[PDB]
Design a protein around this ligand. Sequence first.
Ligand code: SRM
Ligand code: SRM
Ligand code: SRM
Ligand SMILES: Cc1cc2nc3c(=O)[nH]c(=O)nc-3n(C[C@H](O)[C@H](O)[C@H](O)COP(=O)(O)OP(=O)(O)OC[C@H]3O[C@@H](n4cnc5c(N)ncnc54)[C@H](O)[C@@H]3O)c2cc1C
Ligand SMILES: Cc1cc2nc3c(=O)[nH]c(=O)nc-3n(C[C@H](O)[C@H](O)[C@H](O)COP(=O)(O)OP(=O)(O)OC[C@H]3O[C@@H](n4cnc5c(N)ncnc54)[C@H](O)[C@@H]3O)c2cc1C
Ligand code: SF4
Ligand code: SF4
Ligand code: SF4
Ligand code: SF4
Ligand code: SF4
Ligand code: SF4
Ligand code: SF4
Ligand code: SF4
Ligand code: SF4
Ligand code: SF4
Ligand code: SF4
Ligand code: SF4
Ligand code: SF4
Ligand code: SF4
Ligand code: SF4
Ligand SMILES: [Cl-]
Ligand SMILES: [Cl-]
Ligand SMILES: [Cl-]
Ligand SMILES: [Cl-]
Ligand SMILES: [Cl-]
Ligand SMILES: [Li+]
Ligand SMILES: [S]
Ligand SMILES: [S]
Ligand SMILES: [S]
Lengths: 618, 206, 206, 206
Amino acid sequence: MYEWKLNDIVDNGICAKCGTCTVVCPNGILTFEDRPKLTEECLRKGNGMCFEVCPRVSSGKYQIKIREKFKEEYYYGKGDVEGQDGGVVTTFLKYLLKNKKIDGAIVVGDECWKPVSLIVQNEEDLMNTTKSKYTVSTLEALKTAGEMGLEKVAVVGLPCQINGLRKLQYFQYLAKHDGELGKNGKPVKLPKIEYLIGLLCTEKFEYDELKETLAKYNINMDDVEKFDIKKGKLLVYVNGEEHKIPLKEIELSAGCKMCRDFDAEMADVSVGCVGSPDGYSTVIIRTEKGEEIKNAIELKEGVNLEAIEKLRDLKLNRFKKEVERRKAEDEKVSFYWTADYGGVGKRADGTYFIRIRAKPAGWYSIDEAREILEIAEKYDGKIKMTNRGAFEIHGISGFDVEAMVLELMEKGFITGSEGPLVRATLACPGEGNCGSGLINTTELCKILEDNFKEHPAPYKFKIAISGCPNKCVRPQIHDIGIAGVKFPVVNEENCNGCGRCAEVCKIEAIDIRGETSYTNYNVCIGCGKCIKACPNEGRDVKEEGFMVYVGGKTGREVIEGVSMKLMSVEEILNLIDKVLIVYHKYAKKPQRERLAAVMARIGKGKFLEEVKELMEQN
Amino acid sequence: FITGSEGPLVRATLACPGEGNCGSGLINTTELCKILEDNFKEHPAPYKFKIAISGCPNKCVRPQIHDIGIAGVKFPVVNEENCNGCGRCAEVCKIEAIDIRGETSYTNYNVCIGCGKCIKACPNEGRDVKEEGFMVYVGGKTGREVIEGVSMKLMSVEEILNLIDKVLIVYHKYAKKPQRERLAAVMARIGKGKFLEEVKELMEQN
Amino acid sequence: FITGSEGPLVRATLACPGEGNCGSGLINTTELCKILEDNFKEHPAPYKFKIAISGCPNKCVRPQIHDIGIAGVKFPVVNEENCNGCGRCAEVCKIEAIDIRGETSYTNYNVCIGCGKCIKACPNEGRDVKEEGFMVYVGGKTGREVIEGVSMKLMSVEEILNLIDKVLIVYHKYAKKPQRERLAAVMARIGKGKFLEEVKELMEQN
Amino acid sequence: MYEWKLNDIVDNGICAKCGTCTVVCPNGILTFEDRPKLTEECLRKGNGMCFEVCPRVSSGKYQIKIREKFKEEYYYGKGDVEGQDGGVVTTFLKYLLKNKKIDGAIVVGDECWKPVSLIVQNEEDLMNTTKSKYTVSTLEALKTAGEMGLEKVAVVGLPCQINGLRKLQYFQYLAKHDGELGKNGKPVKLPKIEYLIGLLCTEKFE
Ligand code: SRM
Ligand code: SRM
Ligand code: SRM
Ligand SMILES: Cc1cc2nc3c(=O)[nH]c(=O)nc-3n(C[C@H](O)[C@H](O)[C@H](O)COP(=O)(O)OP(=O)(O)OC[C@H]3O[C@@H](n4cnc5c(N)ncnc54)[C@H](O)[C@@H]3O)c2cc1C
Ligand SMILES: Cc1cc2nc3c(=O)[nH]c(=O)nc-3n(C[C@H](O)[C@H](O)[C@H](O)COP(=O)(O)OP(=O)(O)OC[C@H]3O[C@@H](n4cnc5c(N)ncnc54)[C@H](O)[C@@H]3O)c2cc1C
Ligand code: SF4
Ligand code: SF4
Ligand code: SF4
Ligand code: SF4
Ligand code: SF4
Ligand code: SF4
Ligand code: SF4
Ligand code: SF4
Ligand code: SF4
Ligand code: SF4
Ligand code: SF4
Ligand code: SF4
Ligand code: SF4
Ligand code: SF4
Ligand code: SF4
Ligand SMILES: [Cl-]
Ligand SMILES: [Cl-]
Ligand SMILES: [Cl-]
Ligand SMILES: [Cl-]
Ligand SMILES: [Cl-]
Ligand SMILES: [Li+]
Ligand SMILES: [S]
Ligand SMILES: [S]
Ligand SMILES: [S]
């Protein structure tokens, strides 16, 4: 009926039926019935925020996870309400409402097992939403919460819903622009999602399919008191009886076959039954927001982690079997999980490139280079050497990306230097390799990489380290630049005006006069060459070390960083850490505002003064 | 294998993956790089001489600060009959050159860098090509000093070959300090307009 | 009295006292300013258009960031038979372009800006005139942005009048936003080399 | 009454009743009856192109005249049709139509001495517009010509109308921006005003 880009996901059985896309539309022309659908013509043909938040187009997982910095602490517990298992989810939501942490909760109730998305603002309304509904649910109450103007909500969701809503939270980083403007010039109205409470999930069903399946076992769904999925069985409690149906005999919603995420790995806290005794819920705490559940539930340790891990593996194997089937039948596949990994980019022709983060100063062992070539050959890749000294492998099929990246990681290689984060530090050969080198660039590069590699930033962030003021790797137009320097001072007792030093100074900073020489320090760049060329011990070291620049860049615009001063390695590490903090503080446009643009916007002195203050608190 | 790219001569030409490889690529950077290498590799110059070719205005290989720089460009012009003000193109323009107004859109050509992104993103055939080709810069460098080359104009491959040949001749004519004076230094010394005028004259005799 | 120097037109030309008034002056700034005013005062342009004339490279009236800039210059060349390496000239060169060596001296022409002071300070007729005249810059501004104009070359007063006339014509031709696009913005938009090439072609038809 | 800034001119007896303001509105919410009138709410409260073309707010005459570079040659004559005086205006308009110099003429007819602004495209319709109508006239047919898509017109106007239409021609120089965009994101549709034929005038009556 209407042209809509996501029809590619929905019409080919890849859609998770999570409901994320239908809550973000600023024109309100999307609704979720049995699937996402347009209620009228979209002038963009679906080229917009719906498509951009869809977790089955692209997971966004790597860029989200490096920001959330997930932990993984395993507990089990029970609350004080009768729930599906322990009543933990509802008890936690009651605690968050009581303590004014949220204005409401987005939860799933039911009308005779037909799920309904609800915005609940009080304990009484929350009590109708306990228990699992094992059929397609939506997130539509998020739109209602936004119409009501609620500031903050918690959302309970299946893994696919958690993944969509993490893309919503991180939209500016993943889509690289602000939320889509509607016809009236304004973005969609939605509450802030303050807590993401995830459910473990192996599958959900279409309501009609479940009801028909039950009818085959002479069960009237309308009469069921409770459903459960335990140990490969659908449990059905009706008329005071427990009925078991093997899950193998029930058709799952088609999109669950394309699913990889069992335990809602991106949630603040994930809750399930696997791994914990009956009557308790398993609780996997991953973030500081999730850590607040400790205040709501008396938690215990002793989870059966292997029971959880086996379901992770079973779900992954199901996904792999379905992808292989689609490959064999030439059916549509959306390679949404390529974004689980750093260093993966999509080429113009729909295959991918994999960037191996450049090693310090571009040194590679022969064995290392041979290993890269062997992996490239195995996957039909083509070698491209980048201008930061990285191997980049081109032409990789979406079907091979994950396997190849994992093989590279097993051999010890890090894929990365892509996306809004600290890119591979670029250093020259430096002292003891290049005859002009004044500092150990390789080791400083290794130190900077060890401390900051792949650390997130509002936009790409690039560091360069040159061994001398020739600045071959261009530190004076990098976000942070370091250049080795060694300034001379003439020794009056020894210099005899022989004249040799002036000959090696290409910038002509030396004045040979009578029986002596001078240095013009308004021109001298501290290359140290005159000190090394003098045969008469006529030039001593005035000052030497690591010269530092902050706030430069190339690309669309050339900006020279602000010259700072000579700094020690400890000071440089402090500086980089605090620059990243102040950049985060003031950046307003992820994936658009480089550090130099933030400094320009707020004032170079103001930005540098705040960095110095944080450094001194360190 | 050819050992080289050292000393006072035309160094290895630096090109990105370009069109058909990078999703942003607008020109065949590899083939143009091969052409420039075939014509000028290891040709002597008063000092090191570096050429760069970027596939689009993101300029990853920094052509705007090379002795000679080329950047692929593709400028848009809105088709008033098709554009409906949907708003999608403005979302892909990171430098915010696009004005969405009512049922149409506009381009601010004092900001637009000709990346072509809006043309590719439009779902309604609302943006056509205004102008496209190889944008050329002359007289930049990095190293001890950062100098942005003089923006020239769009040029054909044949014109670029003529230009590079003539730049090298005029550089040799006016350079006085081999191994110290880059092209940018010679242009600064004698006047950028004087230098480029003489290059143009030699190109026309060609 | 003429009321003016306001709106989108050629504003009052700004000149320093120059030769015979300022001790550093090398050219007759008052007369050149009078000539430019007589030829172009209040002439329309797409946006304000400002000319400055400095008497020497100190550039007190800032010709290097004006729409058209002129600076008087006088470059030295050492008279090898007369220079005795006394050292006086180096003392008056604030930019330190002079190398005193043994019984002679040298000038670093990658630094010398042609102020002529060494010629005047030498007591031994050791420095003669290498080159002198009106150095010209095109396409600078201050205000909301700082832009340095493109260095051209030394020009005659006859050539400068031709240049200004043709710059104004090419500026009109390519300007799209009256009262918003300065000359520098038009040059940036279409390419500095492209703009200056068109100017030269019109100058040659004159 | 709908808020409209040009009410400061109309309500204080300064309005010339030329009609210029009511032809430029890109939303078509201005009409001219006995005076300029808003037919619905203006979101800008009249802060826009109507006010910016009004010759009684600011003449713009200096910036216009330095561009038009008016001469002043005096003649008298008669055409070949019966007019007010010599029939010169109608004859000239008949010549411009016949030689395809314009697609139509904006002229003032009458219904029993009530003036009516007309867009005429042939000699037959032009002949009903001879003679002076000494009461308030408008320029409203410019809007019709714009709706019809006519490329070029001639306009006959009283001095105040000529002054307003010169501001329209020079809008970007005087208002310092492009023509106002309507709610649909597009500017007003008007023909290019290729000829402005002014009438001498000491007064008009209600
Ligand atoms: C591979 C590489 C070019 C090369 O030929 O070597 C590259 C490749 C891309 N760059 Fe870059 N950039 C690469 C170095 C650069 C550099 C130079 C550097 O980093 O030393 C710059 C300018 C220096 C700087 O940024 O300070 C650079 C400035 C950009 C920009 C403009 C950024 C800006 O702030 O102006 C973009 C576009 C954007 O980010 O919007 C971009 C975007 C890209 C993308 C990801 C665009 C795309 O996919 O549509 C390109 C991937 C194509 C591919 O096949 O890999 N690339 N890019 C370089 C990889 C370096 C590495 O190993 O990590
Ligand atoms: C290998 C390399 C650095 C790297 O880590 O990758 C390099 C290495 C040297 N550079 Fe460079 N330059 C290298 C790229 C650069 C660049 C970047 C570029 O070319 O894209 C620049 C600045 C960009 C530019 O020049 O426009 C650069 C600016 C210099 C300069 C200063 C030139 C100037 O005009 O300011 C010198 C010293 C000199 O020429 O006096 C220099 C001198 C040198 C010498 C030959 C100095 C020496 O031997 O004492 C270094 C050789 C050391 C070695 O181990 O190879 N190198 N050098 C780069 C080789 C590129 C290639 O494959 O051909
Ligand atoms: C009087 C003066 C300032 C002063 O204290 O001396 C001046 C006064 C105004 N300038 Fe200016 N500008 C004056 C020299 C400058 C200069 C310096 C120069 O011309 O040497 C510049 C920057 C140099 C340049 O333009 O290259 C300058 C850049 C501007 C700008 C920004 C232009 C730009 O392209 O960025 C504006 C605003 C605009 O044009 O939009 C402006 C606008 C104005 C206006 C007309 C704005 C207004 O009326 O709202 C000011 C009139 C106020 C008044 O009381 O006169 N004025 N203005 C200067 C008169 C010079 C003369 O005698 O002709
Ligand atoms: C379709 C589905 C499949 C599941 N599969 C597994 C599994 O394989 N293994 C496992 O360990 N656990 C699974 N669970 C989770 C488990 O059944 C319990 O829901 C979980 O342990 C929480 O129990 P509780 O007593 O603490 O929560 P309660 O206090 O009972 O609260 C239950 C919460 O679940 C939410 N909810 C219920 N149905 C839906 C739905 N369809 N979509 C979104 N939210 C919903 C409600 O909004 C409510 O907040 C699944 C749940 C669902 C809905
Ligand atoms: C209100 C008014 C006052 C005038 N006062 C003087 C005066 O003081 N001194 C003087 O020398 N001449 C004045 N004239 C001009 C003069 O009356 C003749 O119109 C002029 O000489 C042209 O005559 P014509 O035979 O060549 O033109 P014609 O061929 O007769 O054509 C006359 C043209 O006048 C236009 N026209 C008529 N009435 C109006 C109007 N109200 N508004 C705009 N356009 C109109 C018609 O469109 C037509 O094209 C005045 C005209 C008007 C309308
Ligand atoms: S208006 Fe935007 S969010 Fe809505 S369906 Fe269209 S592209 Fe999607
Ligand atoms: S996976 Fe979710 S966000 Fe994507 S099309 Fe389906 S319901 Fe929409
Ligand atoms: S298996 Fe669960 S988390 Fe996955 S698509 Fe299905 S309902 Fe969503
Ligand atoms: S920056 Fe200096 S030490 Fe490093 S490769 Fe270049 S010349 Fe050698
Ligand atoms: S510093 Fe050394 S090389 Fe230089 S003039 Fe003195 S003695 Fe000679
Ligand atoms: S340290 Fe280098 S730049 Fe400085 S005087 Fe010595 S040779 Fe010259
Ligand atoms: S310059 Fe453009 S085409 Fe080339 S790699 Fe960069 S983003 Fe791609
Ligand atoms: S050019 Fe295309 S993407 Fe942009 S507003 Fe117009 S129809 Fe939409
Ligand atoms: S071509 Fe690029 S810079 Fe220009 S308007 Fe389009 S997206 Fe923006
Ligand atoms: S620019 Fe030179 S001649 Fe003019 S006042 Fe200044 S120092 Fe004197
Ligand atoms: S040029 Fe003159 S002032 Fe300079 S060292 Fe020679 S004799 Fe002395
Ligand atoms: S002309 Fe001036 S800048 Fe040049 S060497 Fe003489 S005193 Fe120095
Ligand atoms: S919409 Fe604009 S032109 Fe029309 S009355 Fe309003 S301000 Fe005036
Ligand atoms: S444009 Fe003319 S009719 Fe309108 S307010 Fe001004 S003088 Fe009056
Ligand atoms: S005297 Fe004539 S030109 Fe003046 S306002 Fe009246 S009608 Fe217009
Ligand atoms: Cl998912
Ligand atoms: Cl970040
Ligand atoms: Cl040579
Ligand atoms: Cl003009
Ligand atoms: Cl008037
Ligand atoms: Li010396
Ligand atoms: S990049
Ligand atoms: S180099
Ligand atoms: S000004």
